[PDB]
Design an enzyme around this catalytic site. Structure first.
Site, PDB file in Angstrom:
ATOM      1  N   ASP A   1      80.252  71.877  42.459  1.00 56.11           N
ATOM      2  CA  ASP A   1      80.528  72.387  41.037  1.00 56.11           C
ATOM      3  C   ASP A   1      80.522  71.431  40.074  1.00 56.11           C
ATOM      4  O   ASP A   1      81.501  70.611  40.313  1.00 56.11           O
ATOM      5  CB  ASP A   1      81.767  73.480  41.210  1.00 56.11           C
ATOM      6  CG  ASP A   1      82.094  73.967  40.006  1.00 56.11           C
ATOM      7  OD1 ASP A   1      81.407  74.935  39.635  1.00 56.11           O
ATOM      8  OD2 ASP A   1      83.095  73.785  39.315  1.00 56.11           O
TER       9      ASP A   1
ATOM     10  N   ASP B   1      77.586  82.903  44.673  1.00 55.52           N
ATOM     11  CA  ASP B   1      76.622  82.966  43.886  1.00 55.52           C
ATOM     12  C   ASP B   1      75.816  84.177  43.806  1.00 55.52           C
ATOM     13  O   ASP B   1      75.285  84.716  42.730  1.00 55.52           O
ATOM     14  CB  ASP B   1      75.690  81.646  44.109  1.00 55.52           C
ATOM     15  CG  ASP B   1      76.372  80.343  43.994  1.00 55.52           C
ATOM     16  OD1 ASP B   1      77.446  80.545  43.238  1.00 55.52           O
ATOM     17  OD2 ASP B   1      76.034  79.399  44.427  1.00 55.52           O
TER      18      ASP B   1
ATOM     19  N   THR C   1      77.677  74.417  33.168  1.00 51.34           N
ATOM     20  CA  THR C   1      78.049  73.259  32.620  1.00 51.34           C
ATOM     21  C   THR C   1      77.243  72.034  33.268  1.00 51.34           C
ATOM     22  O   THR C   1      77.396  71.175  32.556  1.00 51.34           O
ATOM     23  CB  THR C   1      79.729  73.357  33.147  1.00 51.34           C
ATOM     24  OG1 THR C   1      79.520  73.263  34.606  1.00 51.34           O
ATOM     25  CG2 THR C   1      80.377  74.506  32.583  1.00 51.34           C
ATOM     26  N   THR C   2      76.623  72.083  34.223  1.00 51.19           N
ATOM     27  CA  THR C   2      75.842  71.083  34.870  1.00 51.19           C
ATOM     28  C   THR C   2      74.618  70.976  33.965  1.00 51.19           C
ATOM     29  O   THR C   2      74.286  69.763  33.795  1.00 51.19           O
ATOM     30  CB  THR C   2      75.562  71.127  36.189  1.00 51.19           C
ATOM     31  OG1 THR C   2      76.744  71.239  37.031  1.00 51.19           O
ATOM     32  CG2 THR C   2      74.896  70.355  36.748  1.00 51.19           C
TER      33      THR C   2
END
Lengths: 107, 520, 519
Positions: C56, C386, C89-90
């Protein structure tokens, strides 16, 4: 390199690992030709081992077209004496080096 | 915060450093694998010294700071609930998969792609174990072959002298607490105790709970045939606190006054035992000289100074409850059992309490006698995996011949299935074959024989001589084919050795970095 | 002698802007390999000694806490990404730092930073207009029930996994778990529990709230489990006989008072058990352990009690039964009591498990994991999480685009042809703007072990033939259509991704001098 692996399984003793090492050292020639041809050396050798298992010697590497194709159809052929003398002369040299324990200088 | 002096390891060198840290643990335990494996010296933090070859015990005593090395220790807690014997074989197999993976990283193969090759080749090895497996107890439940199997497992320990007698006890203990048809055996219902003195041949099977405590008085009845058990947290006498009474006697006027009040409490609670119909009284504390004097006249034996955790173990086994005060006594809270005796040990004053059901029960406790405490402690672990061997046979009676015959037969099938995968994972399947050969190779090395000449000789026998797998003799027996030597391990254990070793290698390869701050 | 700064560290000009670019690449380097479902994990240890393992990107950035000022800027943008969307965010961190890498050589050539800002503002505005044109709303398309499309999107994300064989069964459970929710969808509502042993088909889908029930203590053969309309009580009180919290110690010289003190210590425990019976609460869920003596009381009163319940399971219960968590037994009343239609203790797995059913206020459910070991379930726990995200986002936003770097290549091709039509310094900057958008499909090939060069080159030539939905396949190595493979992501999520990435890139370029006041 493919057939010597099967013969290494039928033998016994130290000849199992020694013949297998002799077979795995035969893959350096096709891995080098694939590197100079602009391909993946590791992936090309893997595909050839399958094509030679199911098919015949026709499978190989074509440096002119940059890919795996039929070698006989690309007009690439070499006489048998070149390949036989390559294994015989190289083996006699490798065996001669392994038999040398020490070098001595005289005068 | 604390970014400075933060230890960081990243890149391709991070994976090679993790493998090197993992090989340090595998190379340590590979010498102790097998019955001839060398022992290890353990020096406790308090100065104690113990010697054991048990792999699960070593991993618990090893203190390693490295993070990946800590993951190898956490695997032992998962396997001990299943095998408890070849736990070392999984660490050795996990170290072989990582050692052969180092050669593949030099060729430029991605770590995740390597982990996919092991998972693909693992299912082939597990599938091959199902074909060559043979059964024993299939369709017929019998105790004759079951006892002979446990005699071999105990042969690798120091109990190998008395090994034959302790096999029949573990069989009757598991069948008592649970039925083989139920295929559910709980380890919490089985307890193991021991005391110094005697020999390992004196091991007995008592059905019930046993703790070492004496009677309130030595003249109390030693045999109670009927089942009445009063389990209380307070002794029978005027109420006393948990620490110090400290009675205040000013003069003889208070002495004679309080003694009459105590005298009324003497006969009240002792005669209360017969009102509830109880016979044996289990109290957390002891009795006075006057309390034991009234028990001898009424023939009411009792146990004194019962420990805290011992009260819970007696109420569960005997079917009773914990009674905080005599006001709540009833007939339903009384415990049951077939016999209650006091058995001493030699001239020792221990005199362990013996609670016998005189019938089957759901809980049993095995007691071990021996001349050394360290030998008894190793005898406790000798029965631990022995119960797992019997439990695995109850779950699945299919077995595969051990002694290296299983690992060698699998690599022959995996090596053939490698040429059927036109992809880079083919190299991982070939490296998985050479890794399975390490476990049977470490057995011959620990026996003082040439490892390579023994390994290649067995390969030619399984391919040419006979299709059934042949094992390696590490005990210097007559010949190979351990089927005649009766060295056999369960099939469930073989599937867990490959599954658990694949989990560890897959988790180590996918971790490319380890971060942690330093002392600032 | 007289110095202006006096230990004050400050720098400006080109070297100050170049130093900030190298600092942003360090932050993107840590989350770089974690992009994608198959990406590698990370291991971070705190001062306590425990290790945190996960891919994450939001969790890793929180644990780093980099002291560099420009690095804290990209970290703060990831926090704003969670409130607006909750994922990506990645992608935002990795993409924003890519723009600084492309314009880095142009800065050393003497190009003014203000011109660079003019390019990122104009090009981003055109990318938003292009996404809205490509985005196609799929609802009643081909007259297919929406449940069928949600299952096909779930099997794709769960393919090539440990459950890839059983993903056909798990796809129905993930879709059904989302359908049991209300009109307001939230990921924190649905809980997931793991149970060792059993095959993957043994996984159970519970409509109510279930917990592990670590309670090992006595009280069996009593406390009937079936309750038609019980009163669910939430209490953190410890009912243990001898406990570390509530005890009674009184020192007196009177012998007759000892009988009362021992009874008074049991009186406090009996009072706490009576106050529960006074309100008529049938189900007792305690966070702290419950002694064996307290279990027999409720057993004869036809009431059930279970202790050692985690606090998170009690908070999910509070939002389920409709009551509230009460600390003591004195304030327990019908206001904090809950209600459920069916309460049953199940033996599935061999452990004792408790769950509710038909709670009027329950927006939450519980899923049960069944596998061979714990590592199989822990990875599947997020793997199924997910899949819930894909089904949840598909219901909220029905206008989506092809994922897997498919939309990133079309924005790279469209802006590459437009950059040639703008004579000026804007040509080289917009041309570098399109090339930076190609880092997302490239990292997917490296994290999957494939060859990034062969895939990206053949993919780029394929977009020249007009197909806008083609992208990288994570399972098989080949160029496949992500639209027909049902890999979808909301259009508003991708728009907010480019907006936050462009805003964070323009802010670092706009920084000129770094002033630090010594203190």
């Amino acid at each position: 390199a493919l057939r010597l692996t099967e013969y290494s399984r039928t033998l016994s003793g130290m000849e199992s690992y020694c013949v297998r090492a002799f077979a795995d050292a035969m893959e350096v020639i096709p891995s080098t030709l694939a590197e100079n041809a602009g391909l993946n050396p590791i992936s090309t050798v893997t595909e050839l081992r399958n094509r030679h298992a199911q098919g015949e010697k026709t499978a190989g590497i074509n440096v002119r077209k940059g890919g795996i194709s039929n070698i006989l159809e690309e007009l690439v052929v070499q006489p048998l004496l070149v390949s036989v003398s390559a294994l015989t002369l190289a083996t006699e040299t490798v065996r001669s080096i392994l038999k040398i324990d020490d070098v001595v200088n005289t005068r | 915060k604390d970014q400075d002096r933060k230890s960081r390891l990243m890149g391709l060198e991070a994976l090679k450093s993790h493998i090197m840290a993992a090989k340090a643990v595998a190379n340590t335990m590979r010498t102790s694998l097998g019955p001839n494996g060398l022992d290890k010296m353990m020096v406790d933090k308090d100065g104690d010294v113990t010697v054991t070859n048990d792999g699960a015990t070593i991993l618990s005593m090893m203190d390693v700071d490295h993070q990946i090395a800590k993951l190898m220790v956490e695997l032992s807690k998962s396997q001990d609930d299943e095998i408890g014997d070849g736990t070392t074989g999984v660490v050795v197999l996990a170290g072989a998969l990582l050692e052969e993976a180092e050669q593949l990283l030099d060729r430029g193969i991605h770590p995740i792609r390597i982990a996919d090759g092991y998972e693909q080749a693992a299912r082939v090895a597990i599938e091959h174990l199902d074909k060559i497996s043979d059964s024993v107890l299939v369709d017929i439940k019998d105790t004759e072959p079951l006892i002979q199997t446990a005699k071999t497992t105990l042969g690798s320990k120091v109990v190998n002298s008395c090994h034959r007698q302790m096999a029949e006890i573990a069989v009757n203990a598991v069948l008592t607490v649970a039925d083989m048809e139920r295929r559910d055996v709980d380890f919490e219902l089985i307890k193991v105790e021991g005391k110094v003195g005697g020999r390992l041949e004196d091991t007995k099977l008592i059905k019930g709970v046993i703790v070492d405590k004496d009677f309130s008085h030595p003249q109390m009845p030693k045999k109670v045939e009927d089942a009445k058990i009063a389990i209380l947290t307070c002794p029978f006498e005027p109420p006393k606190p948990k620490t110090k009474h400290k009675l205040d006697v000013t003069s003889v006027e208070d002495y004679k006054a309080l003694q009459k009040y105590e005298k009324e409490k003497f006969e009240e609670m002792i005669q209360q035992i017969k009102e509830t119909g109880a016979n044996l009284a289990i109290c957390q504390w002891g009795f006075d000289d006057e309390a034991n004097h009234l028990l001898l006249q009424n023939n009411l034996p009792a146990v004194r100074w019962v420990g805290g955790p011992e009260i819970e173990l007696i109420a569960i086994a005997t079917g009773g409850r914990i009674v905080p005060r005599f006001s709540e006594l009833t007939a339903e809270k009384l415990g049951f059992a077939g016999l209650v005796q006091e058995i001493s040990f030699g001239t020792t004053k221990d005199k362990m309490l013996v609670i016998e059901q005189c019938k089957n029960s759901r809980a049993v406790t095995i007691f071990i006698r021996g001349g050394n405490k360290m030998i008894i402690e190793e005898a406790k672990r000798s029965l631990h995996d022995a119960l797992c061997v019997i439990r695995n046979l109850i779950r699945d009676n299919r077995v595969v011949y051990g002694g290296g015959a299983a690992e060698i037969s699998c690599a022959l099938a995996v090596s053939q299935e490698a040429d059927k995968c036109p992809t880079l994972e083919q190299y991982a399947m070939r490296a998985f074959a050479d890794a399975l050969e390490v476990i049977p190779m470490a057995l011959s090395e620990n026996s003082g024989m040439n490892p390579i000449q023994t390994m290649t000789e067995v390969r030619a026998r399984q391919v040419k001589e006979m299709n059934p797998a042949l094992g390696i003799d590490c005990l210097h027996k007559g010949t190979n084919d351990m089927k005649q030597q009766h060295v056999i391990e369960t099939l469930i254990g073989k599937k867990q050795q490959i599954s658990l070793a694949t989990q560890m290698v897959r988790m180590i390869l996918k971790i490319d970095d380890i971060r942690k701050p330093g002392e600032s | 002698v007289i110095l202006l700064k006096e230990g004050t560290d400050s720098s400006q000009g080109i070297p100050q802007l170049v130093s900030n670019i190298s600092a942003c690449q360090v932050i993107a380097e840590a989350v770089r390999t974690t992009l994608g479902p198959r990406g590698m994990d990370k291991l971070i240890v705190d001062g306590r000694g425990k290790a945190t393992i996960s891919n994450d990107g939001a969790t890793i950035l929180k644990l780093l806490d980099v002291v560099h000022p420009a690095a804290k800027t990209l970290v703060d943008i990831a926090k704003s990404q969670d409130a607006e969307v909750g994922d990506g965010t990645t992608s935002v961190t990795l993409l924003a730092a890519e723009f600084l890498k492309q314009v880095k050589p142009y800065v050393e050539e003497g190009l003014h930073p203000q011109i660079i800002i003019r390019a990122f503002r104009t090009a981003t505005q055109l990318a938003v207009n292009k996404i809205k044109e490509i985005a196609v709303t799929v609802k009643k398309a081909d007259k297919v029930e929406q449940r069928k499309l949600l299952e096909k999107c779930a099997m794709t994300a769960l393919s090539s996994k440990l459950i890839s064989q059983q993903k056909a069964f798990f796809a129905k459970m993930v879709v059904d778990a989302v359908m049991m929710l209300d009109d307001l969808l939230q990921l924190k509502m649905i809980g997931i529990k793991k149970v060792q042993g059993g095959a993957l088909e043994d996984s159970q889908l519970v409509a109510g709230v279930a917990f592990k029930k670590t309670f090992s203590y006595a009280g069996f053969e009593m406390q009937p489990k079936k309750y038609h309309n019980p009163k669910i009580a939430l209490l953190n009180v410890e009912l243990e006989l001898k406990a570390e919290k509530d005890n009674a110690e009184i020192r007196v010289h009177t012998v007759e008072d000892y009988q009362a003190i021992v009874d008074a210590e049991w009186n406090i425990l009996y009072d706490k058990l009576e106050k529960i019976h006074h309100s008529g609460a049938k189900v007792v869920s305690s966070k702290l352990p419950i002694g064996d003596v307290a279990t027999q009381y409720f057993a004869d009163r036809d009431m059930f009690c279970a202790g050692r319940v985690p606090e998170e399971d009690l908070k999910r219960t509070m939002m389920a039964c409709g009551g509230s968590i009460q600390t003591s037994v004195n304030a327990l009343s019908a206001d904090v009591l809950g209600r459920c239609q069916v309460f049953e203790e199940t033996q599935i797995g061999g452990e004792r498990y408790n769950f509710f059913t038909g709670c009027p206020k329950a927006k939450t459910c519980t899923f049960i994991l069944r596998g061979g070991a714990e590592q199989f379930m822990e990875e599947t726990e997020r793997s199924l999480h997910d899949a819930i995200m894909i089904v949840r986002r598909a219901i909220k936003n029905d206008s989506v685009v092809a994922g897997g770097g498919a939309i990133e290549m079309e924005l790279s091709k469209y802006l590459r042809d437009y950059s040639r039509t703008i004579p000026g310094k804007q040509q080289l900057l917009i041309g570098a703007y399109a090339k930076a958008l190609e880092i997302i499909p490239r990292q997917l090939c490296d994290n999957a072990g494939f060859d990034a060069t062969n895939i990206l080159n053949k993919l780029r030539a394929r977009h020249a033939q007009g197909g806008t939905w083609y992208g990288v396949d994570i399972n098989n190595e080949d160029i496949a259509d992500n639209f027909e493979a049902f890999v979808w992501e909301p259009a508003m999520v991708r728009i907010n991704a480019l907006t936050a990435a462009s805003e964070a890139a323009c802010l670092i370029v706009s920084v000129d001098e770094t002033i630090k006041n010594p203190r």
